[PDB]
Amino acid sequence: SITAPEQGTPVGGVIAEPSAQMSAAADMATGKSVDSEWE
Amino acid sequence: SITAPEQGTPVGGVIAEPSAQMSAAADMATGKSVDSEWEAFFSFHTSVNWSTSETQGKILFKQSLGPLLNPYLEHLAKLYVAWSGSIDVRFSISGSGVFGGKLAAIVVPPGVDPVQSTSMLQYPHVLFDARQVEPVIFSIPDLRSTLYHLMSDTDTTSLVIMVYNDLINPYANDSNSSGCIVTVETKPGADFKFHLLKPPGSMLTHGSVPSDLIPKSSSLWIGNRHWTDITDFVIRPFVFQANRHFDFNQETAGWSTPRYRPITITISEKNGAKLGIGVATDYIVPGIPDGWPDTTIPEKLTPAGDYAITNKSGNDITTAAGYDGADVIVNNTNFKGMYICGSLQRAWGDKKISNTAFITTATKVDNAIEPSNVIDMTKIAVYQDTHVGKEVQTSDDTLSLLGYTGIGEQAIGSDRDRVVRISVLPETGARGGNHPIFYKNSIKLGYVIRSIDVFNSQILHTSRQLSLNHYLLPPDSFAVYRIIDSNGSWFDIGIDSDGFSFVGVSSIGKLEFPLTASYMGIQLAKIRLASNIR
Amino acid sequence: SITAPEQGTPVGGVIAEPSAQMSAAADMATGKSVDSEWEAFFSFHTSVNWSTSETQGKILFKQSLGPLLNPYLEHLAKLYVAWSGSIDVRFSISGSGVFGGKLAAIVVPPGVDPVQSTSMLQYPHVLFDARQVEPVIFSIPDLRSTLYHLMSDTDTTSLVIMVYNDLINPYANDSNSSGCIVTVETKPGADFKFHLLKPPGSMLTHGSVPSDLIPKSSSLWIGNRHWTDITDFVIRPFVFQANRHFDFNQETAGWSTPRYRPITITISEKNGAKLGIGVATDYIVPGIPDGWPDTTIPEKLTPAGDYAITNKSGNDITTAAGYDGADVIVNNTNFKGMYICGSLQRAWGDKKISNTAFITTATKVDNAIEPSNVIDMTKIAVYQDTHVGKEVQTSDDTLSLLGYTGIGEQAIGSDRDRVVRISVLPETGARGGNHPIFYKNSIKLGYVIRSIDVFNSQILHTSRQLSLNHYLLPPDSFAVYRIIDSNGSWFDIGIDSDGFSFVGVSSIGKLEFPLTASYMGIQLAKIRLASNIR
Amino acid sequence: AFFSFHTSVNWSTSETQGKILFKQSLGPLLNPYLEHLAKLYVAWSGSIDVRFSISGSGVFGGKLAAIVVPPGVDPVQSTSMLQ
Ligand SMILES: [K+]
Ligand SMILES: [K+]
Structure with a gap:
C-alpha cells in the first residue's frame, strides 16, 4: 500500500547497465575530491 | 602457390596494432553483451482490435511462418538464400483484468486455407482469457518435408487466433470501438538459422x-x-x-x-x-x-x-x-x-x-x-x-x-x-x-x-x-x-x-x-x- | 504486472515443438556450423592497374577505415549506429619473376590528406615486390580520439599504396608500355564490433x-x-x-x-x-x-x-x-x-x-x-x-x-x-x-x-x-x-x-x-x- | 538518496497506441536539485533513476511501454520504436 520515499520496483537499465569501470574513467581525467571543490 | 579465402602473410598495422584493451572500452561505454541482439527480445508486429461484435468462429490473427515476422531477420534474409527453424510470437490483451472473453490459439500444419468456422476448433486448441496477467508465447515450430526452406516458400506452418467466448464490456458504444487490442510480438527462437550465404548483387x-x-x-x-x-x-x-x-x-x-x-x-x-x-x-x-x-x-x-x-x-x-x-x-x-x-x-x-x-x-x-x-x-x-x-x-x-x-x-x-x-x-x-x-x-x-x-x-x-x-x-x-x-x-x-x-x-x-x-x-x-x- | 523484453509464460507448440534433431539436418546439408561468415573470408573492394608510365611517388590506392570496405558490413550498419575496431585489407599481385619494382604501403593517421610525393615516404613504410607470391594483409588499426565512432565519421585512419620504385619490363622498349595489376580485398578483422542498436524507423x-x-x-x-x-x-x-x-x-x-x-x-x-x-x-x-x-x-x-x-x-x-x-x-x-x-x-x-x-x-x-x-x-x-x-x-x-x-x-x-x-x-x-x-x-x-x-x-x-x-x-x-x-x-x-x-x-x-x-x-x-x- | 518530483501528465482516454507521454534526454534537468547545481559545473557523468505512480489504484485498465533509446537518434510518435 504505502510507498516510501525510495520505494519502487527496479527493472533498471533495459539495454545496458550503469557500469563502474567507466565512471572512474571520467574521474581520472578530471580529478576529484570528497564531493566538493569549494573547500 | 594456392591461397585460400583467408590465407595471406601478415605484417600488421605498422605504426600500431589493434589493441583489445581499446575495443573493450567501447563495450565499456555501451552494455554490449553479444551480437545478434534480436535473438534475445521481442519486436512489435501488429495490433488487432476485438470489438463486441466478433462472434466466435471468427478469426483475428493469421500469419504464416517466416522471417518477415521480425524485421531484423527481414534485413538479413537478403544475405542468405535459405532459412530454417522456429519462431516465438508473443501475445498480450488490452483491458487489464477488466474484461471477459477467452481466445483460442491454433497452429495448423502446412497446406491449408483456414476457415472462420468452429470446425477449426475440432483440433487441439489452446485458450487464454482476457484477464491475462503474464503475456503468452506460442512457440511456432517449422514443420516441413524438405531439409531447408527458401525465402519464397509459403507452404509452412501458420498460427491463428480465433474467438472462443465473445467479450464483455459495458464501457463501449455501437459507433466507436475503443478498447480491446491484441498486440502481437515475435522473436526468432533458438533453433532459427539462416542458410546458404549469397553475395550482394x-x-x-x-x-x-x-x-x-x-x-x-x-x-x-x-x-x-x-x-x-x-x-x-x-x-x-x-x-x-x-x-x-x-x-x-x-x-x-x-x-x-x-x-x-x-x-x-x-x-x-x-x-x-x-x-x-x-x-x-x-x-x-x-x-x-x-x-x-x-x-x-x-x-x-x-x-x-x-x-x-x-x-x-x-x-x-x-x-x-x-x-x-x-x-x-x-x-x-x-x-x-x-x-x-x-x-x-x-x-x-x-x-x-x-x-x-x-x-x-x-x-x-x-x-x-x-x-x-x-x-x-x-x-x-x-x-x-x-x-x-x-x-x-x-x-x-x-x-x-x-x-x-x-x-x-x-x-x-x-x-x-x-x-x-x-x-x-x-x-x-x-x-x-x-x-x-x-x-x-x-x-x-x-x-x-x-x-x-x-x-x-x-x-x-x-x-x-x-x-x-x-x-x-x-x-x-x-x-x-x-x-x-x-x-x-x-x-x-x-x-x-x-x-x-x-x-x-x-x-x-x-x-x-x-x-x-x-x-x-x-x-x-x-x-x-x-x-x-x- | 511488470513485464520485461523477454518475459512471458511459455506454452510451446501445441502439436509439436522445435525438434533440434531436425535443424542439424539443415546444417548437415550445408556447411552451416558458424554464423558471421564475413569475419572469416575476404571480399573484393576494388582493383588497380600499375604500369611503367605511372612514375615514382604516385598514389594508387587510398581508402579510409570504415564499415563500407566490406559490403556485408555496409548492409548491417543500417541496423546500428556505431562501430569500433580494425579492418584487414588483403593485397595480391602476380608479376612475371623477370619484372622488378618495389611497392610501398603506409597506414597514415587521421586528420591528414595524403600527397603524391616522396615526402610521404619520410615515414614508416612497408615495401613489397612485384615478384611477391603470397598475398599480404596490412591490418588497419583504429586510431581514434573517442571511445567509438558513428557512421558519419570520416576523420579516421587510412591506407595508401605508392610506387616506391617503378616497374621494369627489361624486354620492353620504352615506347610500348606494359603493366601488372593489383587486386584488393578486405575482411572485418577481429576487434570489429558495431554498437548502439537503432530502433527503426x-x-x-x-x-x-x-x-x-x-x-x-x-x-x-x-x-x-x-x-x-x-x-x-x-x-x-x-x-x-x-x-x-x-x-x-x-x-x-x-x-x-x-x-x-x-x-x-x-x-x-x-x-x-x-x-x-x-x-x-x-x-x-x-x-x-x-x-x-x-x-x-x-x-x-x-x-x-x-x-x-x-x-x-x-x-x-x-x-x-x-x-x-x-x-x-x-x-x-x-x-x-x-x-x-x-x-x-x-x-x-x-x-x-x-x-x-x-x-x-x-x-x-x-x-x-x-x-x-x-x-x-x-x-x-x-x-x-x-x-x-x-x-x-x-x-x-x-x-x-x-x-x-x-x-x-x-x-x-x-x-x-x-x-x-x-x-x-x-x-x-x-x-x-x-x-x-x-x-x-x-x-x-x-x-x-x-x-x-x-x-x-x-x-x-x-x-x-x-x-x-x-x-x-x-x-x-x-x-x-x-x-x-x-x-x-x-x-x-x-x-x-x-x-x-x-x-x-x-x-x-x-x-x-x-x-x-x-x-x-x-x-x-x-x-x-x-x-x-x- | 531519495526521489524528487519532476512533472505530471494526463494520460486521458483520447490517447492511443503510439502517442508519447514523456520524453526527456538525459541531464541534470530531470531533478530540480541538480539543475540548481549544474550552474556550478560544466560536466556530469552517470545514470539517473526515475519513478512513476499512476493514480489508478486498482481501477484504470491500460498499460504503457518504455524504451531507452540510444544517443544520436530522435524518436518518433509511432509503434515502430517497439521493434
Ligand atoms: K468568365
Ligand atoms: K494561337
Whole structure:
C-alpha cells in the first residue's frame, strides 16, 4: 500500500547497465575530491 | 602457390596494432553483451482490435511462418538464400483484468486455407482469457518435408487466433470501438538459422511493406481525381473509381497515371467546328490521353454559346444573393456537365490568341454530343474556338484539368452510371463490419464563385507508390493506417489490395482537420477497425 | 504486472515443438556450423592497374577505415549506429619473376590528406615486390580520439599504396608500355564490433543520410522551374535560382513550394483594363502567390494585341520552313516575355469563355510595364482580357504555367539581370575542378509549335525532400550520386549543402536518356568527380 | 538518496497506441536539485533513476511501454520504436 520515499520496483537499465569501470574513467581525467571543490 | 579465402602473410598495422584493451572500452561505454541482439527480445508486429461484435468462429490473427515476422531477420534474409527453424510470437490483451472473453490459439500444419468456422476448433486448441496477467508465447515450430526452406516458400506452418467466448464490456458504444487490442510480438527462437550465404548483387529487394502509402500530414494529401487538397472523409457503402485506382498488383482499369500534368492533343477541324475529337499525343492506352478525366455529360446537348443559369425557372441572375436566394437552379446552358481546362491553343500561322476549352467524354453526332461512358478513341470531346475559317487547322493543344461547369449539381463521383470506365468499374461494398469511404476534395465551378464537392477513392500519393513498388499483402487483409484529428480523437483506416480505403465507424462528422497519420500494422480484412471520437 | 523484453509464460507448440534433431539436418546439408561468415573470408573492394608510365611517388590506392570496405558490413550498419575496431585489407599481385619494382604501403593517421610525393615516404613504410607470391594483409588499426565512432565519421585512419620504385619490363622498349595489376580485398578483422542498436524507423537527430534526393529512374524527374521532364544536362560556370532552391537547412530565399498546382489570385480591373495587378491568395510569403514563376520581361513593352514575328523586314513565318529556315525570329510581338496561364477568370456577370492570360514581374506605368528583377506585392502582372466594361469587375482567377512567349531568346535562366530574386540570389561558381550544372527542360511556346529550352537548378524531388527531411552534409563535402545511361557511359554528380549540383567534367555530349541514378557516398568538394564517357 | 518530483501528465482516454507521454534526454534537468547545481559545473557523468505512480489504484485498465533509446537518434510518435 504505502510507498516510501525510495520505494519502487527496479527493472533498471533495459539495454545496458550503469557500469563502474567507466565512471572512474571520467574521474581520472578530471580529478576529484570528497564531493566538493569549494573547500 | 594456392591461397585460400583467408590465407595471406601478415605484417600488421605498422605504426600500431589493434589493441583489445581499446575495443573493450567501447563495450565499456555501451552494455554490449553479444551480437545478434534480436535473438534475445521481442519486436512489435501488429495490433488487432476485438470489438463486441466478433462472434466466435471468427478469426483475428493469421500469419504464416517466416522471417518477415521480425524485421531484423527481414534485413538479413537478403544475405542468405535459405532459412530454417522456429519462431516465438508473443501475445498480450488490452483491458487489464477488466474484461471477459477467452481466445483460442491454433497452429495448423502446412497446406491449408483456414476457415472462420468452429470446425477449426475440432483440433487441439489452446485458450487464454482476457484477464491475462503474464503475456503468452506460442512457440511456432517449422514443420516441413524438405531439409531447408527458401525465402519464397509459403507452404509452412501458420498460427491463428480465433474467438472462443465473445467479450464483455459495458464501457463501449455501437459507433466507436475503443478498447480491446491484441498486440502481437515475435522473436526468432533458438533453433532459427539462416542458410546458404549469397553475395550482394544479388540483393533482390522484394518484401516492400506498407509504410509510405500515406504521408504523416494532411497538407500533402490530394485526391487522385482532382488536384485540390482534402478537407473531409466521406462514407458510402459502395465505392467506385477507375481513372487512377491502383491495386497492389500494380495495375488498374485506368487509362491514366498518377501525375497531374496537362494533356496534349492535336485537334483538327474543317470549317468552323468548335468541337472535335481530341486525339492522343501521350498515352499508356492507345487512343486515350493520360490524365484524362471520367465524368460524362448528363444529357444530349448542342454546345453553341455562353454560360446561363436561371433561378425559379422564371428569371436570370448574376449575383450571390440571387444565387443563394433561389428556389432552385436550372442551368439553361449548352455545355453543362463539362470542364474548364486551360488550352494554350497553338497552331501554325494562327494569331487570335488562345481561348478556354471544355471537355468530356461523349459520342459526337454531327453537331452535338450524347453521354457514353465506355471510352474509346472516338468519345473524346472539346469545345474550344481555335479560330477555324474554311480550312483544316492542325491545331496542337495542351490542356490541364482546372474546373467544372455543371452548376446545380452538388457532388461528383456519386452517380456511377455517369462514370467513365473502359469496360470494367472497380467497386466494393461493406466488409466485416467495415465500410468504404471517399476523400472529399473541393473543386472550381466556372462562371460562379462557389465550389462543389468531389468524391475520391485514393490519395494520389497512395496511388503513385502502388504504381511502382511491389507492396505485400494477402487478399483478405488491410495495410492499416491511423488518423488523429487535432482534437485528440482518432480513427483507423484500412487499405485492401484493390486500393479502396475502408473504415470501421458509422460516422465522422466535423473534426479538427490539421491532422496526422501513422502505421500500426496489418489487420485481417473481415474485422471492425478501431476508433474514438470526441 | 511488470513485464520485461523477454518475459512471458511459455506454452510451446501445441502439436509439436522445435525438434533440434531436425535443424542439424539443415546444417548437415550445408556447411552451416558458424554464423558471421564475413569475419572469416575476404571480399573484393576494388582493383588497380600499375604500369611503367605511372612514375615514382604516385598514389594508387587510398581508402579510409570504415564499415563500407566490406559490403556485408555496409548492409548491417543500417541496423546500428556505431562501430569500433580494425579492418584487414588483403593485397595480391602476380608479376612475371623477370619484372622488378618495389611497392610501398603506409597506414597514415587521421586528420591528414595524403600527397603524391616522396615526402610521404619520410615515414614508416612497408615495401613489397612485384615478384611477391603470397598475398599480404596490412591490418588497419583504429586510431581514434573517442571511445567509438558513428557512421558519419570520416576523420579516421587510412591506407595508401605508392610506387616506391617503378616497374621494369627489361624486354620492353620504352615506347610500348606494359603493366601488372593489383587486386584488393578486405575482411572485418577481429576487434570489429558495431554498437548502439537503432530502433527503426528512427530519425537520426543530426539528420539522415541523403540517398533519396534523386529518384533512380528518369521518368520521375522534373525540374524546379517548369514541370516538363528532364532530357539533358547543361554545364555553366555560374548557376543561380531562388524559386524552389531548398538547401539542407530546409529553407531558401524564394517564395514558392515544390508543387505545380494552379495559382489562385484576384484582380480588380475597372474600365477596359486587360491587365491589372494580381494579389496573393495562397502563399508562404505575404503578397506573393505560391508557385509563381521567376522571370522578368526582357524590356519595357505595351501589352496590346496578338502575336508578331518577322524574318528581318519583314516576311512573317506562318509555317515550319520559314521558321526553321529563318535567320532571326526577332519577335515584334507586344506581350513578349510572359507565360500563358490557362485562365479560369470567373466573376459575376462575365458570361464569357474565359480568355487566356499572360504574366510577369514588373511595375505598371499606367498602360505598360517596366522590367524589375525583384518581386514585391506589386510587381505581379497580368494580361488576360477579363471582359471589362467600366462596370468594375473584381474577378477571381486561377492559372497554370504552360509555355513561354519570348521567342528566339536563349534558354531561360541564363540571365541574372532578368531572374526574380527577392533580396538574395542563391548562387555558386565552381569548386575545385568540379563544375556546376543546370538541368534542361523543354518548355512550350505559344504561336510557333516548336519548343524552347529551360534551365533548372534541381529536380523537383531533390527539392521536395529538402523542404522536409533534415540531412547531414558538411559544407565542404558532396552527396555523390552516380549516373548510368542505357549504354554504360557514367559520370558522378555532386550536390552541395546549398543544393546546387556539381560535376567533374567539362562536357557530356549525347546519351541514351532512359538513364538511372545510384548512391555512392560522401566525397569532399576539394576533389574532382569521376566520369567514364564513351 | 531519495526521489524528487519532476512533472505530471494526463494520460486521458483520447490517447492511443503510439502517442508519447514523456520524453526527456538525459541531464541534470530531470531533478530540480541538480539543475540548481549544474550552474556550478560544466560536466556530469552517470545514470539517473526515475519513478512513476499512476493514480489508478486498482481501477484504470491500460498499460504503457518504455524504451531507452540510444544517443544520436530522435524518436518518433509511432509503434515502430517497439521493434
Ligand atoms: K494561337
Ligand atoms: K468568365
